[PDB]
Design a protein around this ligand. Sequence first.
Ligand code: HEM
Length: 289
Amino acid sequence: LVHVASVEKGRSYEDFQKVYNAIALKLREDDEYDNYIGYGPVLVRLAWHISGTWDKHDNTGGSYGGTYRFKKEFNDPSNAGLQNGFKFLEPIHKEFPWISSGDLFSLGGVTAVQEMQGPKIPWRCGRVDTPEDTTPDNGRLPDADKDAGYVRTFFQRLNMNDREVVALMGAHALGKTHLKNSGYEGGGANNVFTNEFYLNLLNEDWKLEKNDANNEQWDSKSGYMMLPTDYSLIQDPKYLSIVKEYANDQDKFFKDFSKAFEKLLENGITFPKDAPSPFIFKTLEEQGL
Ligand code: HEM
């Protein structure tokens, strides 16, 4: 399968900056969501889940087709809770009906990262909605109750290496788990993008406990939690080295996350040689808005 990026007709940087701005303004406005976390984290998770269905072997899944809009994918047990992100984006899509679904979902993630003070993430337009029969089956997103070997193997399907995996997982500085969604009991949440996932891993006194859904998770007295797959990053010696690197270099983490997240959001897409360069959107703050 080949998915060729096709620019929404006549659109350019300014059009997409307007969409970015609408998302960013709504992120600022709707501040009460999820006990005042806001919609930032769920939008990042949405962008990842619509991308993380990709399979490098046959180019099925991925962000291109915007298939999360279809019931099979929308109702994936792995996507429980993301409906909130979709509902957030609905009025945005209504205001800008010309943007494709894949472009909107991925741009939501970029906007959220940047507005939460994370790194700039270059972003490319041109995802094109594909039909319902192109929706990937459930079961392509990762389990959280597994070890480092599982994580490593899983991410090979997305063409991610050890550094890319550890960098991407840094997004777990954001938001929280919700028992009703995933069977994991949320701890201290955050809506500012930093390298504190790695600092928490290395510095907290972690205890392996069972939550009210009878699943194991790692908890600290300070009120933080880690999934078994999160904690696996300090159990595996190769992942541990990289965790230490990012814990000690905020800029390096930002740069590596930016590259890995763009790659994740672009997997499966063929960009014509004369396609526009990636866009780097200004934050509301940078615009004085
Ligand atoms: C082994 C890989 C991963 C596993 C097993 C995993 C699992 C989970 C689980 C179980 C939750 C809780 C969902 C809920 O209860 O609402 C969660 C939340 C989240 N995940 Fe991951 N995740 C992984 C990788 C990633 C990646 C690569 C990203 C983005 C780069 C990401 C971004 C997020 C964000 C931002 C949240 C917070 C959502 C919210 O607060 O509503 N995760 N993850």
